[PDB]
């Protein structure tokens, strides 16, 4: 009974909402231009297929269509649809419909992972049962079996553009596509946004809240960074001083800004500060991508295995470099693998400002050395066991040791995945 829902496209998204509409008693039927899409076997047997070709006939007898964020609303078949005047949304638009719970709602470009993270983190050791997902992560219907009290939503521009009304209680962009991003804040009970990026302050009524972050001194009510005189730099909101930067583990300004973002969002939700800072003072990054590890001996060592180019590797000694130089710290840096024929010059002026050693692994480990000597010591290691011993012989409190390789991983690992493990495996084994 009742109107058809067509679902355009499956893969691990059309698998959710074919399941969902099928559970909650709707006619479904499904079509994808794959013959055997991903997920085939995964909906129920009753439910009408049309596979290897967007069955144009079937989408302009729907009710509705979900469309797979995969798929763009510009296709012929479904532009056929939307001129016939059928609804046309996506599983955050079937999401919203399920549940009223508070929705935080994050879009923008790649720092976003951080911040969904580390807002999730903030809200389950606040005590709330939260469900985290969208975008690349959980399904987000699939989020609703937790019966959670808080979503969490990571959305791209493409789930965005089929959403309406998504009333979030709080949203954010993180950097017309600029058009779809801020579809996320269509009946927004909160805003945060960036000073930062002008682009990221949504056109809302003068009755919703709005709270900025940034990386300068925030007017009231608004966070930001405060500097002792001594350089010290000190997350704040308003005049506040909240916490030092070096008492968290994550570091650099974007970290910082990140970090800030996540204050905003759960001030926003109503987590308590006393919370929200212990929870970032206990965050250790997310995994391979200037991930805190450990701190033995006072040094602080961090997995930056993601960081296989040269201007990845300028930007973590950068902002590793500048958040210890303060305390007088110094970077035992590991650095080499497969160079792809880049040139390692960048690197040069980075580390001879904070550096103190410089342990060269891997294959390209000679072209490396032409690069950057004179700058700091050298040193060689055959293996990643005795680079991370040499840099723990090399430092003292206040020093920090990063892999950050500048260098592709495949002569001596799979990936920077198996790279950043094993680097984590041989810190914890340092007595």
Known sequence: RGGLKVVAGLGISGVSAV????????????????????????????????????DQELLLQAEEIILSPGLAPQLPEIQAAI???????????????????????????????????????????????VAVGGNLGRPALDLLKDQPELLVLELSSFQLETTS?????????????????????????????NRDDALSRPLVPDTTPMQSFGLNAPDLNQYGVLRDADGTLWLAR???????????????????????????????????????????????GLEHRCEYVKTVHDVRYYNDSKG???????????????????????????????????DFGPLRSSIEKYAKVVVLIGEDAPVIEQAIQGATKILHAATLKEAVELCQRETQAEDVVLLSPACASFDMFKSYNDRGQQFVACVNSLV
């Open 308 to 342: 296989t180019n040269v201007g990845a590797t300028l930007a973590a000694i950068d902002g590793l470099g500048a958040a210890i130089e303060v305390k007088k710290g110094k970077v035992a840096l590991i650095l080499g693998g497969q160079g792809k024929g880049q």
């Open 83 to 129: 001129a016939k005047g059928i609804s046309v949304v996506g599983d955050i638009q079937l999401l919203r419909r399920a549940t009223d719970v508070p929705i935080v709602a994050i879009t923008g470009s790649n720092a976003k992972s951080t911040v969904t993270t580390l807002i999730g983190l903030m809200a389950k050791d606040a005590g709330k049962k």
């Open 19 to 54: 399941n969902f509409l099928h559970e909650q008693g709707y006619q479904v039927a499904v079509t994808d231009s794959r013959p055997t899409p991903p997920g085939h076997d995964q909906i129920p047997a009753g439910v009408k297929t049309s596979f290897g070709q967007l």
């Open 238 to 284: 308003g005049l506040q001083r909240l916490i030092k930067s070096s008492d968290l583990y994550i570091q650099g300004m974007h970290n910082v800004a990140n970090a800030l973002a996540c204050l905003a969002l759960g001030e926003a939700i109503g987590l308590p500060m006393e919370s929200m800072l212990e929870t970032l003072k206990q965050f250790k």
């Open 165 to 193: 009304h998504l009333n979030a209680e709080v949203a954010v962009v993180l950097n017309g596509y600029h058009q779809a991003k801020h579809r996320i804040f269509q009946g927004a009970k909160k805003v945060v946004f």
